[PDB]
Amino acid sequence: DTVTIRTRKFMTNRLLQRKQMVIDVLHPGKATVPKTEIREKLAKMYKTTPDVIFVFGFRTHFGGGKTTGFGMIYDSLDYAKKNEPKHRLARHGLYEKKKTSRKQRKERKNRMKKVRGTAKANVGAG
Amino acid sequence: HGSLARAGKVRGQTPKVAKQEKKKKKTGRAKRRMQYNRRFVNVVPTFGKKKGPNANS
Amino acid sequence: GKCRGLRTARKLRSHRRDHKWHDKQYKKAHLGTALKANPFGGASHAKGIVLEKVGVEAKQPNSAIRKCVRVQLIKNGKKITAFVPNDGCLNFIEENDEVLVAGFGRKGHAVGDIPGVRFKVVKVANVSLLALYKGKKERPR
Amino acid sequence: PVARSWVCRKTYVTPRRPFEKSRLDQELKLIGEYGLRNKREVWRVKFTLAKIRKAARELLTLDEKDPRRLFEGNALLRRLVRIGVLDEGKMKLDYILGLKIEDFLERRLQTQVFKLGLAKSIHHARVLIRQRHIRVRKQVVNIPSFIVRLDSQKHIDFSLRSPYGGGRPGRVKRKNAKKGQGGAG
RNA sequence: GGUGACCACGGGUGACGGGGAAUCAGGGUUCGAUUCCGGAGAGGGAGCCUGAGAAACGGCUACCACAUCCAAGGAAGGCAGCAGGCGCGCAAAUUACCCACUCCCGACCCGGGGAGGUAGUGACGAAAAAUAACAAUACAGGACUCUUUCGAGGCCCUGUAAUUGGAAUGAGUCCACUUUAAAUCCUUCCGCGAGGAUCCAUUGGAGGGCAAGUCUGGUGCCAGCAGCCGCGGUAAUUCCAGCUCCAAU
Ligand SMILES: [Mg+2]
Ligand SMILES: [Mg+2]
Ligand SMILES: [Mg+2]
Ligand SMILES: [Mg+2]
Ligand SMILES: [Mg+2]
Ligand SMILES: [Mg+2]
Ligand SMILES: [Mg+2]
Ligand SMILES: [Mg+2]
Ligand SMILES: [Mg+2]
Ligand SMILES: [Mg+2]
């Protein structure tokens, strides 16, 4: 009822295949807004479905009257799975990555030099 | 020379006392209100030949 | 009088240069001696082992026994008397116990009475006399 | 190497002649007269003014009609009128010198809470401001010692989201209400 | 032949060089190993390959100086990368998470980066800033007005108390959201969360310099105090204590 999502600084990024602007969320005593609602309420806004809108940034400031941030819009999900970084697609269940976890990589890859070129042993791995 | 027996003669035999308890003293900025108030605006009576802020009667 | 001239920037500099090896407060600081002499090797405090407890007799006008500690510093193996400040605290310190000895405030002068004692004890077995003589932290065991 | 900031510098100076009496007996008035947090908070304003006065005095040594004086001067004067100290276009510099602490105190938020009725006793003000009761313009202000721009004097007002102002009676009245509904009723 | 008291040459440095710092009426004085620039060294020297580009140390060759495994024939050693430990020491952080930011190398949009960022530790230090406010009482007072004063009307006040009283809030805790990479932290907020006996401010002082008691206990040239001046020998404004106050807080 009381949210009123007003945008600033819209740019038609021909060359990243996008529309991109500062989201300015008003909100009264009710607390923040989640990025799901904001996507669906920004979807009917520009009429592009919620699917193709990626939002980060969002920083509230005293009183809880207002919260700024950055959201943006590709002209197809096909491009979004291309121009967009991983974290923003992985933010909602569309693209995840391996959990090897950094020191498993390092401990492995500092072996496989010890072994020569016998693939079998490099596949031996950790 | 000298006898080191007498180290801590005095704290030794001074009879200890309780530290009491009344008022959790007001602090911070209210302290400073209480301060000014109690020696500027309030009492400021007919002078009695200088003060004695911690002196006796 | 002074030299006063206009191409006299040296006779002046070199005048005001040497007429500092007649200052006292710089010939401590810039000569060498100090760093070489003070058991505290230019260092604010220092740690050392209590090798015995010694009463010192105060300078005539004020009679009393001062209650100090012969220390041997770790870094040098240089010995020391340090007056254990505040009443009945010598009672705390036992022999062979590791103390953090700091200065007196006169930086080299012996303080007031305590004839020829530059140093004062602070800590004792990682405690601090201030905590002991207040009864906050007990003696370790 | 790292990113990060530094450039941290003090906001104040402590006095030399460390307890004159006369100096204490001034600096106390100031604390009561206007309900100040502490003593330092004076020598904040004391240090800030001494900047200005030395900035001004820096200019009074220059010849007139010289690009700096005219520029830095206006800029400096404007900055004072802007916060409501020099008035009407008093704006010609020498005057800056004749100016005392009382002023950058009178234009702290705290003072301009009861100066505009709002509070009810000077310490309410400092409480009320901390308590996130009062707002300026639209931001809810937490800070007593926010020097108020002269423009933004008429927009100090009881917050939209606070008990006096409206909405959600605070938890004390909510609990002693629920004692009447739940406990009594 | 060249240099020299316009101080060479010799010695020293708690000396990597600048850019700056804190101090500061003007002038200096000391510090700058300190993230920016410039130099050097990877235990120490020398020589080396290789390389455009190195005399390259996350190469090697000895030697010297160090040090590991051993089947005793031999073999592998370089934290002044990041973490960590030991020793030294007055004196200094986690075997943390990550390429998401800035950038770099590659054959390269795609990997990697202890370069770097993010957490943790962290009174090195700087900013802001709670530790209560207010009404009515009970009073304790003091400028109008009223009273010769004693008294009273009261616009003014302020002290303590009763807390009489409810109002307001945060420290916490914790639904929820954001954040971010995932958090965390911050900002947002539902829900709980202040009557002191609590949700509890300390460190030095209280002769003077120097703001603050010839208040009260005890010791009696002892203990002890005291940066200097000094106090202590039987009423200590000075020691150890109690209560009160002061400065910053
Ligand atoms: Mg040397
Ligand atoms: Mg080494
Ligand atoms: Mg090299
Ligand atoms: Mg080499
Ligand atoms: Mg290395
Ligand atoms: Mg340190
Ligand atoms: Mg790092
Ligand atoms: Mg600080
Ligand atoms: Mg507190
Ligand atoms: Mg004094």
CB atoms within 10 A of CB D85: 19
- The three state secondary structure string of C57-115 is ECCCCCCCECCEEEEEECCCCCEEEEECCCCCCCCCCCCCCCEEEECCCCECECCCCCC
Q: Which residue in this structure is represented by tokens 């309410």?
A: D124
Q: Are the C-beta atoms of residues C98 and C104 closer than 8 Å to each other? A: no
Question: What is the separation of C-alpha C114 from the centre of its chain, rounded to a whole number of angstroms?
Answer: 12
| DSSP H/E element including D52 | helix D40-60
Nearest alpha carbon to residue C50 among C27, C37, C68: C68
D49 and B CB contact within 8 Å: no
A108: Cβ contacts below 8 Å, ≥ 6 apart: A125, A126
Instruction: Give the span between the Cα atoms of A69 and A57, in whole angstroms.
Output: 5
Angle, CA A92 vertex, CA A91 and CA A98 arms, to 5°: 65
- Do D92 and D60 meet the contact criterion of CB atoms below 8 Å apart? no
Please state, in angstroms and as integers, the Cα–Cα distance from residue C54 to each residue in A122, A126, C84, following that order.
Answer: 73, 68, 10
Separation of alpha carbons D76 and D69, rounded Å: 10
Longest dimension (CA), chain B: 62
> Contact, A67 vs A61, CB < 8 A?
yes
Nearest to D33 by CA among D97, D125, D118: D125
Find where tokens 């004020």 sit: C62
With the C-alpha atoms ordered C129, C133, C135, C139, is the resulting torsion angle positive or negative?
positive
Token pair in block for residue B11: 């704290």
Residue C129, number of CB atoms within 10 A of its CB: 20
Which stretches does DSSP call E strand in chain B?
none
β pairing state of C68-73 and C79-83: antiparallel
Kindly give, in sequence order, each residue whose CB lies less than 8 Å from that of residue C59, ignoring residues fewer than 6 positions away. Answer: C113, C115
Instruction: Give the span between the Cα atoms of B22 and B34, in whole angstroms.
Output: 17
Cα atoms found within 13 Å of the Cα of residue D178, Cβ hemisphere only:
7
Please tell me the distance from the alpha carbon of residue D138 to that of residue D154, in angstroms, as a whole number: 12
What's the DSSP call for residue B40? I
Strand partners, A24: A6, A68
Q: How far apart are CA A23 and CA A45, in angstroms?
A: 12
- Give chain A's end-to-end CA distance (angstroms, integer): 56
Rg (chain B; Cα; Å): 21
Three-state secondary-structure class, residue C27: helix
Angle at A33 between CA A28 and CA A39, to 5 degrees: 130
Burial class (CB in 10 A: 0-12, 13-18, 19+), C20: exposed
For tokens 């923003």, name the residue: A88
**Chain D 105..134 CB hits on strand E (< 7 A):** 120-124, 126-127, 130-133
Q: Which nucleotides of E are covered by protein (CB under 7 A)?
A: 7, 14, 22, 35-36, 88-91, 96-101, 112-118, 125-135, 141-142, 157-161, 166-170, 175-182, 187-190, 192-193, 196-198, 200-202, 204, 206, 210-215, 217-219, 221-233, 239-249
Interface test with D, best of A30, A62, A67, A68 (most D CBs within 10 A): A62
Question: Using an 8 Å Cβ cutoff, are C121 and C84 in contact?
Answer: yes
Q: Which 8-state DSSP code applies to residue D103?
A: H
Q: Given the structure tokens 């080191």, which residue do they identify?
A: B4
> Which chain A residue has its CA at the smallest distance from D140's CA?
A63
Q: Across-strand partners of C119?
A: C82
Parallel, antiparallel, or unpaired for β C79-83 and C119-124?
A: parallel
Partner residue opposite D135 with nearest CB, options A61, A63, A66: A63
Q: Are C66 and C87 in contact (CB under 8 A)?
A: no
> Which helix (H) or strand (E) segment is C53 a member of?
strand C46-54
DSSP code, position D18:
T
Are A62 and D139 a contacting pair, CB within 8 Å? yes
Residue with tokens 């009491």: B20
Q: For residue B43, say whether its CB is under 7 Å from any atom of strand E.
A: yes
Give first-to-last CA distance, chain D, whole Å: 68
**What distance in Å separates the CA atoms of residue A72 and residue A18, rounded to the nearest whole number?**
7
Q: Is B17 exposed, middle or buried (0-12, 13-18, 19+ CB in 10 A)?
A: exposed
Q: How far apart are CA B36 and CA D30, in angstroms?
A: 9
Would you state the structure tokens that stand for residue D152, as one six-digit string? 């933004």
**CB proximity A124 to D under 8 Å:** no
Return d(Cα B13, Cα B26) in angstroms, integer.
Answer: 35
C-alpha to C-alpha distance for C108 and A104, rounded to whole angstroms: 60
Beta-carbon-side half-sphere exposure of residue C112 (alpha carbons within 13 Å): 7
First to last CA, chain C: 71
Q: Is D152 exposed, middle or buried (0-12, 13-18, 19+ CB in 10 A)?
A: middle
Tokens of D119: 């509070």
CA distance linking residue C135 with residue C91, whole number of Å: 13
The C-alpha torsion from A82 through A88 and A93 to A94, rounded to 10°, is 0
**Phi (first) and psi of residue B12, to 5 degrees:** -45, -55
Of the candidates C121, C123, C116, the residue with the CA atom closest to the CA atom of residue C71: C121
Q: Decide if D123 and B28 are in contact by the 8 Å CB cutoff.
A: no
**Distance, CA of A55 to CA of A22 (rounded, Å):** 10
Using alpha carbons, select from D123, C90, A103, D98 the residue that is nearest to residue B34: D123
- Three-state SS string over A53-112 comes to EEEEEEEECHHHCEEEEEEEEECCHHHHHHHCCHHHHHCCCCCCCCCCCCHHHHHHHCCC
Residues A54, A71: contact at Cβ < 8 Å?
A: yes
A-D contacts at Cβ under 8 angstroms:
23
Which chain D residues in 35-54 sit with Cβ < 7 A of strand E? Answer: 37-41, 44
* Termini Cα distance of chain B: 49
Specify the DSSP class assigned to residue D153.
G
Residue pair C111/C56 in contact by the 8 Å Cβ criterion: no
Beta-bridge partner residues of A55: A71
Is-contact D29 B36, C-beta < 8 A?
yes
C117: exposed, middle or buried (Cβ count in 10 Å: 0-12, 13-18, 19+): buried
**Residue A90 tokens, joined:** 């992985």
What are the percentages of helix, strand and coil residues in chain D, rounded to 5?
50, 5, 45
Residues 1-30 of B with CB under 7 A from strand E: 2-3, 6-30
For Cα atoms A111, A117, A118, give the angle at the middle one, nearest 5 degrees.
95
Which residues are paired to C53 by β-bridges? C69
3-state SS class at A18: strand
Q: How far apart are CA A72 and CA A79, in angstroms?
A: 13
CA angle in degrees (0–180, nearest 5) for A103-A105-A107: 65
Query: Which residues lie closer than 8 Å to A112 by C-beta, 6 or more apart?
Result: A122, A125
Which nucleotide's C1' sits nearest to the alpha carbon of D144? E129
Short-list B18, B37, B17, B15, CA closest to B26:
B37
Answer yes or no: are the C-beta atoms of C101 and C119 closer than 8 Å: yes
> What is the spatial distance between Cα A111 and Cα C31, in angstroms, rounded to a whole number?
59
Stated as kind and residue range, the H or E segment containing D25 is helix D22-33
Distances (CA, A) of C68 to C80, C86, C101: 10, 11, 11
A32 touches strand E (CB under 7 A): yes
DSSP, residue by residue, A27-39: --SS----HHHHH
Q: Which helix (H) or strand (E) holds C9?
A: helix C9-18
- Measured in whole angstroms, how far is the alpha carbon of residue C58 from the centre of its chain? 18
How many other CB atoms are there within 10 angstroms of residue C34's CB atom? 16
Q: H or E segment at D46?
A: helix D40-60
